[PDB]
Design a protein around this ligand. Sequence first.
Ligand SMILES: *[C@@H]1O[C@H](CO)[C@@H](O)[C@H](O)[C@H]1NC(C)=O
Lengths: 247, 29
Amino acid sequence: IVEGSDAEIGMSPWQVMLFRKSPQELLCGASLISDRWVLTAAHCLLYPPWDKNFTENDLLVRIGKHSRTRYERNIEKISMLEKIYIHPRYNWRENLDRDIALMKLKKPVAFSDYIHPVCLPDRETAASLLQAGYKGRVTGWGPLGQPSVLQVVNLPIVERPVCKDSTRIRITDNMFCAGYKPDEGKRGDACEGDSGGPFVMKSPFNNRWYQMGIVSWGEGCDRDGKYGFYTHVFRLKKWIQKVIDQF
Amino acid sequence: GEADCGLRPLFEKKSLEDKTERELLESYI
Ligand SMILES: *[C@@H]1O[C@H](CO)[C@@H](O)[C@H](O)[C@H]1NC(C)=O
């Protein structure tokens, strides 16, 4: 996260962190959607141009964390993975269309004040919250000096035409973009290590937080005038449900 | 995972507001 502020304790209790087992390194963000299921970006697990193709046993997740470096006794939980499911139509060669993966925990995580699931959006929530100018929230431990505690930014969704002209890549309806214009109304942004993490929005109608997007590809905290892209969670909701029901 | 989803034990469950959530709700024009 670049140009964020310090998150508060328990502000983002669905925040999950993806680690490489060996050597230990933070790979990505992720989110908790039930006691056993973790949503993340496919490019966090499978990216062949960088020789990245993790199995379950290469990875672990840590949940309920706040401080990047301090061990949080009786607060934070660690979990191993039973199974990884990457969207079969994930397009890593071109545009990272369908950049989505699910991870099943070996064992259920107990919810607490620090660990709690975010909602998947329903149609009505997608239809009314996903509008150009409406703001969402990204949280993470991406490099921008590196965060001591979890960082938060809030970013406006960008108009599709402005997204399209911002990049040479062929964008799709399965993704949306967010960020402040090269003008200025702030200059916050998700970064490389925030990838996989949730883009959440709070519903005024019912007071619940919904995960509307998954932070997609970033390199550094520099997008060179561009906007970050987000996998459109509601459009991929049937797929998420299909994986969960069968497995 | 869906009954209590999206309601934070330290925020909504306590009638507590975080520091920047107003910025999001104010944005919904
Ligand atoms: C990744 O590794 C698995 C297990 O070795 C293999 O079956 C698969 O072909 C690999 N996939 C890609 C896209 O490189």
